[PDB]
Design a protein around this ligand. Structure first.
Ligand SMILES: *[C@@H]1O[C@H](CO)[C@@H](O[C@@H]2O[C@H](CO)[C@@H](O)[C@H](O)[C@H]2NC(C)=O)[C@H](O)[C@H]1NC(C)=O
Ligand SMILES: *[C@@H]1O[C@H](CO)[C@@H](O[C@@H]2O[C@H](CO)[C@@H](O)[C@H](O)[C@H]2NC(C)=O)[C@H](O)[C@H]1NC(C)=O
Ligand SMILES: *[C@@H]1O[C@H](CO)[C@@H](O[C@@H]2O[C@H](CO)[C@@H](O)[C@H](O)[C@H]2NC(C)=O)[C@H](O)[C@H]1NC(C)=O
Ligand SMILES: *[C@@H]1O[C@H](CO)[C@@H](O[C@@H]2O[C@H](CO)[C@@H](O)[C@H](O)[C@H]2NC(C)=O)[C@H](O)[C@H]1NC(C)=O
Ligand SMILES: *[C@@H]1O[C@H](CO)[C@@H](O[C@@H]2O[C@H](CO)[C@@H](O)[C@H](O)[C@H]2NC(C)=O)[C@H](O)[C@H]1NC(C)=O
Ligand SMILES: *[C@@H]1O[C@H](CO)[C@@H](O[C@@H]2O[C@H](CO)[C@@H](O)[C@H](O)[C@H]2NC(C)=O)[C@H](O)[C@H]1NC(C)=O
Ligand SMILES: *[C@@H]1O[C@H](CO)[C@@H](O)[C@H](O)[C@H]1NC(C)=O
Ligand SMILES: *[C@@H]1O[C@H](CO)[C@@H](O)[C@H](O)[C@H]1NC(C)=O
Ligand SMILES: *[C@@H]1O[C@H](CO)[C@@H](O)[C@H](O)[C@H]1NC(C)=O
Ligand SMILES: *[C@@H]1O[C@H](CO)[C@@H](O)[C@H](O)[C@H]1NC(C)=O
Lengths: 236, 366, 49
């Protein structure tokens, strides 16, 4: 039931500054008023984050995704390698009431979109392996970090109320762990899902790299500040 | 003192002999409430089973499976485990399970085994000689067998080749025994490969229907998700014991704590990577760990040439858990520890044998 | 066929080095107490070759 649209979704591929966003808790250990140095995959400070205003993008080691969402236009995500029945494919959808995660060899169309009047962007769904249902994930800045290490799919999330006009604010906010998946797929590309009525969406994408960070834990165990040990001599 | 010093005479002074520590009392283990049981009931208690040549295949993953009830129940006529002993299933586990269920005759029970041949073993279901898993079989004469004959169940008898391991063939094509071609009509050299079971309540033991389910456990590199529940027990406090909190093992005394774990941490450490607090997976409360007491012991003596009575000092140990020198004489608790075998006096003289914190002892008794 | 040689197959625990066990008692494999009665979850620990 999927048909290619007439107009091209040619979104301007702009660039902007990451500033000091993209920090998440690396483990589940409580620490109180201490400085801890750890080496892991992070988003480098003051990096170059790509702005889209629906192409297939590489996954690399991990992905940082951000959206100044209004009225919940973004709906889900697709992950895979060949994006067909030849390989297992991951699908995540956040409809009005629940979130559904599926691991199946779907047959996606050339332009998937959720449609309005539940899932019809795939011609077939066979050999399903993993299913999951949970509470909904979602002026409203939504930040997510997706990682895939040794057959484990980690998703970190954060929601923020913002009043700034255009770009990412200058501030610090750590990302708390959200979901873990014990499934092994060698994901290499991914795609964004929109539910556009049959008749102007902006988001930001950045990539992770391995490096060392220093984090500060206050009395209550919350991360309030961080330092990148490879930015400039003062930081080192 | 004599043995440590390796001499038969000892001069006046204080000597360090050995150490002292509090032994743990008992063990405790804690684990989550256990949920998401595997659905064995819908498989074994299924109202209708499929035929042997169309065996039902079921995939089991991401659940907890209890084989204790299956092993203990005597309702199963045949319980044959080949890969491992039944008692060890609850300990180690694989990444997925496959269940193949069907109904056969009572005599064909041994055909479902590694390195076995027969009509079933070569035309309906095949097991590799390296297969690992278990087989369960139980009579169903009162249910599967029909007074008019359970002709619904069919078995394949005719095929040019055998069946591969875990391979199912359901072709209804007319088998051609000879070289004479047939236009879909059975003749002298053409026959239907499938024939019906003829179960009746009065047929005899061996011909009675038997429901058979084989379980195969596979360990693909994906993380394991299905195996037995983890046993747990209650918890104690104010006693040096050893614990296995959700895979984190260690000794110490557990007390109540006022720390505020943020809602997703599990355990806390302060510095130098030493655990201080934990959260029990059932009550979801924050506890506190303290190492139970230990310290060195020392002996104060005035010299073998003078006398033969001594005093004993435990360093940095509160005079609450000392334990023949458990009561002995009057016990004195000092800033340096606890002391047994000497009397505290209100006078003050010069220092003979230093003890610590501004106090010392001498021989007068001691 | 020679069947004079038999080996143990079930034991409550392992064996310390250079020990010998010749006792022939029924094995209570399951939770049901055999009480010296052979049957379900009760097997002879000696198996021939
Ligand atoms: C939003 O998604 C949820 C999750 O799939 C939907 O709830 C399910 O709907 C199916 C439809 O037949 C039912 O079979 C399930 O039992 C429902 N599950 C739960 C937990 O409710 C829900 O209907 C969807 N809502 C909309 C508007 O599409
Ligand atoms: C359909 O699902 C089956 C079972 O889930 C897949 O079978 C796997 O095949 C690979 C290929 O070598 C084996 O390594 C696995 O052990 C098989 N079993 C698993 C993964 O459980 C089959 O590959 C799937 N089909 C497709 C096209 O991916
Ligand atoms: C850390 O935790 C402490 C203790 O819970 C917080 O202190 C409380 O802050 C609230 C403000 O919302 C006051 O109403 C309470 O009276 C405070 N209680 C105590 C005992 O101080 C503190 O706000 C938390 N956050 C930080 C950054 O310290
Ligand atoms: C199939 O159903 C029977 C009947 O409900 C189950 O047998 C019961 O098992 C429970 C748990 O051990 C006992 O408390 C009952 O006394 C049993 N009832 C009878 C009549 O025996 C059986 O466990 C079910 N099989 C499976 C695989 O779930
Ligand atoms: C694990 O299970 C126990 C037992 O069912 C739960 O303890 C109960 O908690 C409720 C909520 O306060 C009490 O009303 C009951 O009296 C408790 N029962 C017992 C036997 O202590 C516990 O809440 C469960 N925990 C989780 C995380 O599921
Ligand atoms: C040895 O242990 C006892 C038992 O706890 C200690 O006695 C406590 O002393 C504090 C301080 O005065 C009181 O607040 C507690 O109420 C006492 N507990 C009891 C059970 O009486 C004693 O202080 C310890 N020894 C030393 C040298 O500190
Ligand atoms: C980010 O990339 C754009 C695209 O070339 C470039 O113009 C801009 O200078 C970059 N910003 C940096 C390197 O800080
Ligand atoms: C993904 O592909 C790579 C390269 O082909 C392979 O090494 C890896 O095992 C694959 N991971 C899977 C199939 O989960
Ligand atoms: C030590 O022993 C000698 C002889 O054994 C004795 O004369 C001397 O008084 C002793 N010293 C003491 C008791 O301080
Ligand atoms: C003498 O010492 C005892 C304890 O050994 C004490 O209770 C008492 O008060 C002391 N008397 C004086 C006069 O200091």
């Amino acid at each position: 039931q999927c048909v290619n649209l007439r107009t091209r979704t040619q979104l301007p591929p702009a660039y902007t500054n990451s500033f000091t966003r993209g920090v998440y808790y690396p483990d589940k250990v409580f620490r109180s008023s201490v400085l801890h140095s750890t080496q892991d995959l992070f988003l480098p400070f003051f990096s170059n984050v790509t702005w889209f205003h629906n192409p297939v993008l590489p996954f690399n080691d991990g992905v940082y995704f951000a959206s100044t969402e209004k009225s919940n236009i973004i709906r889900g995500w697709i992950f895979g390698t060949t994006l067909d029945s030849k390989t297992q494919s991951l699908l995540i959808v956040n409809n009005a009431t629940n979130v559904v995660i599926k691991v199946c060899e779907f047959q996606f169309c050339n332009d998937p979109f959720l449609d309005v009047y539940e899932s019809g962007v795939y011609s077939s769904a066979n050999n399903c392996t993993f299913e999951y249902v949970s509470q909904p994930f979602l002026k409203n800045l939504r930040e997510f970090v997706f990682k895939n290490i040794d057959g484990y799919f980690k998703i970190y999330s954060k929601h923020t109320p913002i009043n700034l006009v255009r770009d990412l604010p200058q501030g610090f906010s750590a990302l708390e762990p959200l979901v873990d998946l014990p499934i092994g797929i060698n994901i290499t590309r991914f795609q964004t899902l929109l539910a556009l009525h049959r008749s102007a969406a902006a988001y930001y994408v950045g990539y992770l790299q391995p490096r060392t960070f220093l984090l500060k834990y206050n009395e209550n165990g919350t991360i309030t500040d961080a330092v990148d040990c490879a930015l400039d001599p003062l930081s080192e | 003192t004599k043995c440590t010093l390796k001499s038969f005479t000892v001069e006046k002074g204080i000597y360090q002999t050995s150490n002292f520590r509090v032994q743990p009392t008992e063990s405790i283990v804690r684990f989550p409430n256990i949920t998401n049981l595997c659905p064995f009931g819908e498989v074994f208690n299924a109202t209708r089973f499929a035929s042997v040549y169309a065996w039902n295949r079921k995939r089991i993953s991401n659940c907890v499976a209890d084989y204790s009830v299956l092993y203990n129940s005597a309702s199963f006529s045949t319980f044959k485990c080949y890969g491992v002993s039944p008692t060890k299933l609850n300990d180690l586990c694989f990444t997925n399970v496959y269940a193949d269920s069907f109904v056969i005759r009572g005599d064909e029970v041994r055909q479902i085994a590694p390195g076995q041949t027969g009509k079933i073993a070569d035309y309906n279901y095949k097991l590799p000689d390296d297969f690992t898993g278990c087989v369960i079989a139980w009579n169903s004469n009162n249910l599967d067998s029909k007074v008019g004959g359970n002709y619904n169940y069919r078995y394949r008898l005719f095929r040019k080749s055998n069946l591969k391991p875990f391979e199912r063939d359901i072709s209804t094509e007319i088998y051609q025994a000879g070289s004479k071609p047939c236009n879909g009509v059975e003749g002298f050299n053409c026959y239907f490969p499938l024939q019906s079971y003829g179960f009746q309540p009065t047929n005899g033991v061996g011909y009675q229907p038997y429901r058979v389910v084989v379980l195969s456990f596979e360990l693909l590199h994906a993380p394991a998700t299905v195996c037995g529940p983890k046993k747990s027990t209650n918890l104690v406090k104010n006693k040096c014991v050893n614990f296995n909190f959700n895979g984190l093992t260690g000794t110490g005394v557990l007390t109540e704590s006022n720390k505020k774990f943020l809602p997703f941490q599990q355990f806390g450490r302060d510095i130098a990577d030493t655990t201080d607090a934990v959260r029990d997976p059932q009550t979801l409360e924050i506890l506190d760990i303290t190492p139970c007491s230990f310290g060195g012991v020392s002996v104060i003596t005035p010299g073998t040439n003078t006398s033969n009575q001594v005093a004993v000092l435990y360093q940095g140990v509160n005079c609450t858990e000392v334990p023949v020198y458990s009561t002995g004489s009057n016990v004195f608790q000092t800033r340096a520890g606890c002391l047994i075998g000497a009397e505290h006096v209100n006078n003050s003289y010069e220092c003979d044998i230093p003890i610590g914190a501004g106090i010392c002892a001498s021989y007068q008794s001691i």
